[PDB]
Amino acid sequence: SELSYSYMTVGVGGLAKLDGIEGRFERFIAEHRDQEGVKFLGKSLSYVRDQLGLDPAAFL
Amino acid sequence: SELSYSYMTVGVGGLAKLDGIEGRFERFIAEHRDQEGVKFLGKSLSYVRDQLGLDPAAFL
Amino acid sequence: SPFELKDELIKVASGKANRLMLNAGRGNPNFLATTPRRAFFRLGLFAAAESELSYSYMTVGVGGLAKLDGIEGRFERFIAEHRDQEGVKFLGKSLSYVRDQLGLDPAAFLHEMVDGILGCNYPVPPRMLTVSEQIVRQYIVREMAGGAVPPESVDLFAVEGGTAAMAYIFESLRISGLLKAGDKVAIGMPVFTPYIEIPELAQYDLKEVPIHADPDNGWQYSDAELDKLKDPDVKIFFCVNPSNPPSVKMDQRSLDRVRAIVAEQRPDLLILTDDVYGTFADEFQSLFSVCPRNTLLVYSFSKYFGATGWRLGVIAAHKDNVFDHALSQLPESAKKALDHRYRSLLPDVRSLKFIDRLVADSRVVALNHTAGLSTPQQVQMVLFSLFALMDEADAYKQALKQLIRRREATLYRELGMPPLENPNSVNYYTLIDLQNVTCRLYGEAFSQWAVQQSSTGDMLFRVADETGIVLLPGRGFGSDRPSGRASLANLNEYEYAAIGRALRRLADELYEQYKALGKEK
Amino acid sequence: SPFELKDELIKVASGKANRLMLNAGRGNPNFLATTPRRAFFRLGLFAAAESELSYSYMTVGVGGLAKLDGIEGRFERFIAEHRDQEGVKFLGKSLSYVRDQLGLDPAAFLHEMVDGILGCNYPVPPRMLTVSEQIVRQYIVREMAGGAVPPESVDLFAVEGGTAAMAYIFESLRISGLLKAGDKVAIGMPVFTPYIEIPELAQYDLKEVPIHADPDNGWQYSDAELDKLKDPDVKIFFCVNPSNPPSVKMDQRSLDRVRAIVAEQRPDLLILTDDVYGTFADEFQSLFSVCPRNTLLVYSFSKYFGATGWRLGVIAAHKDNVFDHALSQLPESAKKALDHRYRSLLPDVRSLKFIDRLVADSRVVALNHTAGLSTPQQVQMVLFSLFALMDEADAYKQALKQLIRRREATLYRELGMPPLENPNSVNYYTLIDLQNVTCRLYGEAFSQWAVQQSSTGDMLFRVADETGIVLLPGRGFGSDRPSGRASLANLNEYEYAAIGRALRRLADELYEQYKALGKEK
Amino acid sequence: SPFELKDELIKVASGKANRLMLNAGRGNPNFLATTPRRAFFRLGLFAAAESELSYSYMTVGVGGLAKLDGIEGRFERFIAEHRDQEGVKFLGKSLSYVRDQLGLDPAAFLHEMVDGILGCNYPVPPRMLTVSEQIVRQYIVREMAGGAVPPESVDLFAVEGGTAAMAYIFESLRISGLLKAGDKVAIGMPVFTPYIEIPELAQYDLKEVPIHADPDNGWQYSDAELDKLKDPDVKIFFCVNPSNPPSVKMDQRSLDRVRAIVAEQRPDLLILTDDVYGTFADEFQSLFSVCPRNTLLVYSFSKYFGATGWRLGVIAAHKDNVFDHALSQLPESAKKALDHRYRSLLPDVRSLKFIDRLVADSRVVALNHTAGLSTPQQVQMVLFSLFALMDEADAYKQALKQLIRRREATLYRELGMPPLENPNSVNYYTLIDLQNVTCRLYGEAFSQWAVQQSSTGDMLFRVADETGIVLLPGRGFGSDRPSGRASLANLNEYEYAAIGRALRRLADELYEQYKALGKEK
Ligand SMILES: *Cc1c(COP(=O)(O)O)cnc(C)c1O
Ligand SMILES: *Cc1c(COP(=O)(O)O)cnc(C)c1O
Ligand SMILES: *Cc1c(COP(=O)(O)O)cnc(C)c1O
């Protein structure tokens, strides 16, 4: 969100774009693989994608 | 550039590929969100993309 | 004698280094290309993580299959977060080269590499992993040929190292008949024991045809000698270029001839060349260069990158080669026989390229769809290739040369300094010749005396006793000279100097005789 | 029909996953043991560094040979400085186990591993790396036998995966004669296409002897059927335990018999068992258990650890086995013949164990001293072993079972739920039987009607058309029932459910006929 | 024809790379010097911080002017706190070199660089930033001259790239009259389209005087041809050294002559040399070498450092040059005219050096005090210089050479291998000559036939159609040979090979005619 709000204002934030979102989610995941929550927050994406076979990006 | 010059030579560097460039710019941005310049270098991308509505990748 | 000789030699031989020399008549490089190695391990680390992030349940040991979608992005991330490590810096540029110079599908390339290193899938196709073939083939056609061959015209077969390469080729030849029992096979010599023993088998029973290399002219093959292939009953030519033990490449003359013979009077000729010591040389043209449609090129990654243990090699073969024509000029009988064999493979068994058979042959056909080299190996091999394809200065190649020159220097320090630098010698092996040594140490006089006073065998045991180092004999002369074949790539500065310390210690024991037994005159 | 069938199936088959099933009649695991994998890459990283710190000149790419002196200390350091990474935590305990449970030379073990992973030296001995053999053999005798066999009595041969294991064993048998043309070979059935094709070759020309497994009794071999081996002219027994496609282990009864037969009336019998699906099972006894001196055990690391691409396997063989006795009860003629062959190997060719030949045979003897499996592979394989030897809870084994049960559940959700849980079934493969399915969905009435209204072939294409998934046929019945063989280890939850969505979509198309065509009555 | 040719070529031309070639008859380097680039960005980062720490109020965006006092200390600090980054390591040594080899005011140098990169002040003086001139001039006199010229005697003018350099020089010549309408200008040829069009203008209306380069003698200028300058009515000489498209330097002979002519019979001669491709060459002497007082040296940083987009160049000019003498041998009329023009500049307008005018001319005098090249650019250019001045091994220069040799090799792999290595060729551009190609592929016979069967234009379109690559025509022959001018610096290995794949695909289409149409004889 903050990276979608185009002006230089601190509190505000915009709408998350959908294009290229797996890549980004993926980045976030690797940069935090240490935290107990993100380890799971990742596999979920697998399951939503590899077992339910749904649109990963959509899902995210 | 350095990551486009295919031989093992230190000074040289090649031409920036356009494919997948938002992802990368995005990565660079998140890994430096601390520096006063990159915080802005990011929002610009929004504005070029969300307000002027231009080809983000092209722009980058 | 030279079978009970080696017998008691082992009895003293100290090492493995010297024991392999003694058992396989080859030296195992005490050095190795590490950069591609690190890149490999590093690539696995990234791969390992892709996998864990594809196994959807909460279980620690398990991991799934790497997805292909979005993979450049990720590889790219991994690269930037580790740009510090010596291996990943290279693991990145490779991607450039595969993409910006070979112009291949980057993503495709990556996923083949990633999945390839996790060795979690059967080699598809068995012959060799799609891109790995386009990459590694590029390495070969450049070092070996470079001259004519567009890489797009070469086919490769991933095999467990030259060794496997042979046991595959021969057997394959016999299975199909491109080679019938009692055929004439030309053998460039001198060659090391092993190869002159594959034809000397029962399942082959073929006949030798030495093609002697002229010592007095730097172990080059004599114009005459090469003309023997003119003889229309000599089915195939067997060469190791550069040669082992000589350690030399076939000069422009040597090549040109075969080029002609094959071209003028022998287009039916088959060539099986083992051009491993090939890459060491500054400039090098392989028989596969001059006769691309009549040759079967065997390259082993083992010597140059110190990677013997990986067992990495390829069997190169043009797309329009005789081996495939010959499978045509065959009696309609055998054809329909083979068609019963390769019946599971496909519908038209008469379209099956030879190269493609070597494969099917290797694992008794029926398993074909599970034959091939391990995906990890294919990957490592690829990495070793791009490491060579991107070392534009040859800093690595330059480094080894000098590593030889030095081992050379040290060896001969106490034996009349090093020999005449042969521009076609690769020096992987050096020939310590007793005569020549003394003709440099004391003079033409003394020389002749000791050459008759001592034997090769005394040399080889005198050294393997004082030091513990095995030295190969001088095969293919007039059995008239004690000579010593040392490898300049399997030992350290202090050991080579030790070799000399003995050879010279002994060249003095003699001189003290020629001296003391002369005063009786 | 079943050769042009597969023909047009491929024409629609979507994948590689399904394409291998179709081509090799086997499922490639969509999962894999990663911990040992990470440990591997991590081990290389340490190895890489040992090497750079052994290459004495100032050159970046090059690296030398790992010294053995002081190596535990160093490995220990590396371990403590990385205790954070998932792989090194395990890479450490291994060292314990190799040292505190197997009681082997720790340092020795390490240096073999380190040097082994840098694949910079030829596999010495070729058969299998010293400690790797003592370790990996420990894995085998425990899972496969466990009963009698002291690991110190088993010999192992490192080969490129089961596949290689066969092409080595058979050929080796023929070379030496423990198998003569026109012999009787017992084949436990049903088995998948490939294996019943190796004997059906020209270089063998042997005769089949099916040993049918009784479907109505969970694909177990019938007492009678096994008695055929009593026939003194049946030279060897060929089994795959657990079976493929059945996917079951030979119960205590089945074993006991062979145990007797062999022991009472057939101590001349040879056994070649492929016990890969062996490890999946909770408890499992391999034919190598009961008849250790008459069996040749082939184990492949490929299915259990998802490591097909590594091509890792062993050929187990007791030290006192018939294969070696039989090489004695041989005409003095052949003996002196073999003695010409294996002449380079040693002095007394009549002492050469069979196991040891399989080796020499594999690369046309003369190269023996360069044959064997890549040192990296040997290492990985070892790591996969200790990973299994140290998973005391079986958390990994438990994890896969459940991964099967689930894929099972999902598949049969819309087809009358899962079958009767067979305590001897490993379920790697499931049998979707049209009859049984409908007798659970609609009733004995409807069943009989559709079984005659549809064929296996319609099933297999109906599915491979709606989804894109290849399904194996039901080999070995009365060709009287459309059945479907699905693998529970090569696909994902959503795809299996997709299989069902079709099978059931089709089981309704029929029911709407039995319904609508009944009202005309 | 060659204007509607290019027309429909664009219609197919795929790229920008090939589109610039086509539009400017020049190749844009697909490579670039990055180290100086990083140093630049890094320098700005330090500069940015100096500035914020000079803006005394609490406002985030704003920043002030970098103080000069104590600046080495600070730069030094910044350097030590970043010695890890590839750019700052170099950004430091530069300071040494500027201080320990050129012996200039370190602090001065730094502050000019820092303030220079923040581009917050007008270029003072407009001609070129004080130290930047002393540094960058050092680069020029060394590569270009090196022979005589003490750098302290050269003057430089910072301009927007060669391009600007011309439009400045010519116009400047006309404004002042050192060039009057209808003068004779000598043009070394062949040259690319653009330059032979500046004189062909209305605001100039001058006359051509080709000075042909002899193809049969490697595009060198023939003794005779150069003698034309002897003609006292030829006001100036226009050369591009090395030449474009030929890509060669004027050998020692060529130079010596002009050296003489100028010296013996033409000290009134003016020389305008564009020595950009100058630096690529191993050793190189520029016309500015031999005739320092009669030449105007134009150097562009764009090709060598891949920095076309920066538009960086200089106009070198001795301190005692004719251009300044000539402004004296002028009618007292014009003099007092110019004195009205350059009236704002100073008191004595007859002291104004030519170099200094080029400046004033560039922005319609009145603005002189705001003309010049951007301070950032001046800085980058300086950094590119010191990067060249400190690469003592030429590792960069060596790297590009090889990058050419390789692109060369790849191109000609399927066209009779590469041409005769010319020691004066820089190879930036290669000449694919249809004749020569076939005389290497098939023979003198075939050659002559196809040379008349095909045209340059078919070549250029055949390639730009199969691949999408634009190829320059062979200007300046007897319009008698299809030739192809490829640039070895604007494409990748896989594309050049693609060029060949076509050229050769086409050299076979012909051979199949000479072959098939010969059999009718
Ligand atoms: C050592 C060497 C090679 C390498 O054999 P691999 O299976 O590839 O290990 C090949 N041929 C000869 C003559 C050699 O000296
Ligand atoms: C898949 C499987 C194996 C593994 O073969 P590898 O060479 O070891 O890949 C062995 N036998 C059967 C019956 C199989 O199903
Ligand atoms: C490309 C090139 C240059 C560079 O021109 P810039 O303004 O400096 O971009 C100069 N002259 C010729 C002949 C060229 O080929």
Alpha-carbon gap, residue E403 to E397, rounded angstroms: 10
The tokens for D214 are: 């009784």
Q: Which residues contact C332 (CB under 8 A, 6 or more apart)?
A: none
Alpha-carbon gap, residue D99 to D109, rounded angstroms: 8
E250 and E220 Cβ atoms separated by less than 8 Å: yes
Question: How many Cβ atoms sit within 10 Å of the Cβ of residue E57?
Answer: 6
Cβ-based contacts of E403 with chain C (< 8 Å): 392
Alpha-carbon gap, residue A30 to D514, rounded angstroms: 57
Angstrom distances, CA of residue D358 to CA of D194, D317, D332: 21, 11, 21
Q: Which residues contact D343 (CB under 8 A, 6 or more apart)?
A: D349
CB neighbour class for D409 (10 Å; exposed up to 12, middle 13-18, buried from 19): middle
Question: How many Cβ atoms sit within 10 Å of the Cβ of residue E146?
Answer: 14
Angstrom distances, CA of residue C137 to CA of C142, C157, C382, E500: 9, 10, 9, 19
The shortest C-alpha distance from C330 to chain E (Å) reads 30
The tokens for E49 are: 């911080």
Which residues from B are below 8 Å from C when comparing CB atoms? 3-9, 14, 19-20, 23-24, 27-28, 31
Give Cα C416 distance to the centre of its chain: 32
Q: Which residues contact D396 (CB under 8 A, 6 or more apart)?
A: C61, C62, D33, D387, D388
The tokens for E185 are: 């200008």
Which runs of consecutive H residues, i.e. helices, occur in C179-251? 223-226
Q: Which residues contact E21 (CB under 8 A, 6 or more apart)?
A: E27, E28, E470, E472, E487, E490
Which residues from E are below 8 Å from B when comparing CB atoms? 30-35, 37, 48, 306, 387, 391, 395-396, 399-400, 403
Ligand whose nearest atom lies closest to the CA of D273: 2
Reduced DSSP (H G I as helix, E B as strand, rest coil) percent helix, strand, coil of chain D, to 5: 50, 10, 40
Alpha-carbon gap, residue C416 to C5, rounded angstroms: 28
Alpha-carbon gap, residue C41 to D41, rounded angstroms: 5
Residue B7 dihedral angles phi and psi, to the nearest 5°: -110, 165
Nearest CA in chain E to B40: E61
Pairing of β E295-300 and β E313-318: antiparallel
CB neighbour class for D40 (10 Å; exposed up to 12, middle 13-18, buried from 19): buried
The tokens for E81 are: 């706190």
Alpha-carbon gap, residue C41 to E66, rounded angstroms: 48
Q: Is the Cβ pair D377, C374 closer than 8 Å?
A: yes
- Numbered residues of the known binding site of B: 53
Question: How many Cβ atoms sit within 10 Å of the Cβ of residue C8?
Answer: 11
CB pairs under 8 A between A and B: 33
Residue D157 dihedral angles phi and psi, to the nearest 5°: -130, 120
CB neighbour class for E61 (10 Å; exposed up to 12, middle 13-18, buried from 19): exposed
Q: Which residues contact C440 (CB under 8 A, 6 or more apart)?
A: C415, C416, C417
Alpha-carbon gap, residue E359 to E362, rounded angstroms: 5
Alpha-carbon gap, residue C200 to C198, rounded angstroms: 5
Element at C237 (helix H, strand E): strand C234-240
C47 and C505 Cβ atoms separated by less than 8 Å: no
Ligand whose nearest atom lies closest to the CA of C369: 2
Alpha-carbon gap, residue C99 to C185, rounded angstroms: 43
Q: Is the Cβ pair C160, D122 closer than 8 Å?
A: no
Residue D340: DSSP 8-state? H
Rg of the Cα atoms in chain C: 25
CB pairs under 8 A between C and D: 266
Nearest CA in chain B to A9: B43
Residue D53 dihedral angles phi and psi, to the nearest 5°: -85, 25
B46 and B56 Cβ atoms separated by less than 8 Å: no
Three-state DSSP class for residue C358: helix
Nearest to C150 among E398, E413, E493 (CB): E413
- Domain extents in chain D: 1-25+394-521, 26-149+371-393, 150-370
E456 and E483 Cβ atoms separated by less than 8 Å: yes
Angstrom distances, CA of residue E411 to CA of C379, D319, E25, E52, E248: 28, 62, 19, 53, 20
Three-state DSSP class for residue D26: coil
Question: How many Cβ atoms sit within 10 Å of the Cβ of residue C375?
Answer: 28
Residue type at D459? M
The tokens for A20 are: 């290229």
- Numbered residues of the known binding site of D for L-aspartate: 103, 244, 485
Q: Which residues contact C264 (CB under 8 A, 6 or more apart)?
A: none
Peptide bond into E210 cis (omega under 30): no
Alpha-carbon gap, residue C342 to C352, rounded angstroms: 9
Nearest to B47 among A6, A24, A27 (CB): A6
Three-state DSSP class for residue C308: helix
**Cα angle D62, D65, D70; round to 5:** 130
Residue type at A7? Y
Alpha-carbon gap, residue C53 to C114, rounded angstroms: 13
CA atoms lying within 13 Å on the CB side of residue E458:
14
Which runs of consecutive H residues, i.e. helices, occur in E413-519? 434-441, 444-453, 456-466, 493-516
Q: Is the Cβ pair A27, B26 closer than 8 Å?
A: yes
Cβ-based contacts of B41 with chain A (< 8 Å): none
Alpha-carbon gap, residue E310 to E160, rounded angstroms: 8
Strand partners, C155: C317
Alpha-carbon gap, residue E501 to E239, rounded angstroms: 35
C432 and C486 Cβ atoms separated by less than 8 Å: yes
Question: How many Cβ atoms sit within 10 Å of the Cβ of residue E325?
Answer: 15
Strand partners, D486: D430
- CA nearest neighbour of E94 among E147, E132, E129, E151: E132
Q: Which residues contact E79 (CB under 8 A, 6 or more apart)?
A: E88, E91, E92
Q: Which residues contact E136 (CB under 8 A, 6 or more apart)?
A: E128, E156, E314, E381, E382, E385
CB neighbour class for C218 (10 Å; exposed up to 12, middle 13-18, buried from 19): middle
Instruction: Tell me the best of D20, D23, D26 to mutate to test the pocket of ligand 2, counting ligand atoms within 8 Å of each CB and taking the most.
Output: D26
Please work out whether the CB of residue E240 comes within 6 Å of at least one atom of ligand 3: yes
Pairing of β E270-274 and β E234-240: parallel
E284 and E147 Cβ atoms separated by less than 8 Å: no
Ligand 2 pocket by Cβ (under 6 Å) = C 370; D 26, 161-163, 240, 244, 274, 276, 300, 302-303, 308, 311, 313
The tokens for B21 are: 């460039």
Please work out whether the CB of residue E502 comes within 6 Å of at least one atom of ligand 3: no
- CA nearest neighbour of D441 among D366, D390, D508: D508
Alpha-carbon gap, residue D45 to D54, rounded angstroms: 15
CB neighbour class for E64 (10 Å; exposed up to 12, middle 13-18, buried from 19): middle
Total residues belonging to chain A: 60
Alpha-carbon gap, residue E356 to E126, rounded angstroms: 9
- CA nearest neighbour of A49 among C55, E207, D373: C55
Ligand 3 mean position, distance from CA E276 (Å)? 7
Element at E384 (helix H, strand E): helix E375-389
Ligand 3 mean position, distance from CA E311 (Å)? 9
CB neighbour class for B39 (10 Å; exposed up to 12, middle 13-18, buried from 19): middle
Residue indicated by tokens 């690991």 = D151
Nearest CA in chain E to C96: E492
Q: Which chains touch C (3 or more CB pairs under 8 A)?
A: A, B, D, E
Q: Which residues contact E95 (CB under 8 A, 6 or more apart)?
A: E75, E106, E109, E110
- Numbered residues of the known binding site of D: 103, 244, 485
| Architecture of the domain whose range is C1-25+394-521 | Alpha-Beta Complex (3.90)
Residue D252 dihedral angles phi and psi, to the nearest 5°: -50, -35
Residue type at D39? A
Nearest to B7 among C72, C76, C392 (CB): C392
Q: Which residues contact E106 (CB under 8 A, 6 or more apart)?
A: E72, E95, E98, E99
D276 and D300 Cβ atoms separated by less than 8 Å: yes
Alpha-carbon gap, residue C488 to C103, rounded angstroms: 39
Q: Is the Cβ pair E406, C393 closer than 8 Å?
A: no
To the nearest 10 degrees (0 to 180), the angle between helices C71-80 and C106-118 is 70
Please work out whether the CB of residue E483 comes within 6 Å of at least one atom of ligand 3: no
E242 and E228 Cβ atoms separated by less than 8 Å: no
What secondary structure does DSSP assign to E38-88, as a single string? HHHHHHHHHHHHHHHTT--SS-SS---PPP-TTHHHHHHHHHHTTTTSHHH
Q: Which residues contact E484 (CB under 8 A, 6 or more apart)?
A: E431, E432, E433, E434, E456, E459, E460, E463, E471, E472, E473, E474, E503
Q: Which residues contact D438 (CB under 8 A, 6 or more apart)?
A: D416, D446, D447, D450, D451, D507, D510
The tokens for D199 are: 């004997």
Nearest to B9 among E37, E306, E399 (CB): E399
Q: Is the Cβ pair A42, C53 closer than 8 Å?
A: yes
Alpha-carbon gap, residue E236 to E183, rounded angstroms: 9
Strand partners, C315: C298
The tokens for C282 are: 């500054």
Q: Which residues contact D106 (CB under 8 A, 6 or more apart)?
A: D72, D95, D98, D99
Alpha-carbon gap, residue C337 to D398, rounded angstroms: 50
Nearest to C102 among E402, E406, E494 (CB): E494
Which runs of consecutive H residues, i.e. helices, occur in C363-491? 375-389, 395-412, 434-441, 444-453, 456-466
Alpha-carbon gap, residue E9 to E468, rounded angstroms: 9
Please work out whether the CB of residue C314 comes within 6 Å of at least one atom of ligand 1: no
Please work out whether the CB of residue E241 comes within 6 Å of at least one atom of ligand 3: no
**Ligand 3: nearest atom to the Cα of E274:** 11
Three-state DSSP class for residue D321: coil
Element at C93 (helix H, strand E): helix C86-96
B44 and B26 Cβ atoms separated by less than 8 Å: no
The tokens for A25 are: 């989610």
Chains D and E physically touch (3 or more Cβ atom pairs below 8 Å): no
Chains E and B physically touch (3 or more Cβ atom pairs below 8 Å): yes
* CATH code of domain C26-149+371-393: 1.10.20.110
Please work out whether the CB of residue E21 comes within 6 Å of at least one atom of ligand 3: no
C508 and C479 Cβ atoms separated by less than 8 Å: no
Q: Entry resolution in angstroms?
A: 3.3
- CA nearest neighbour of E273 among E252, E257, E290, E256: E290
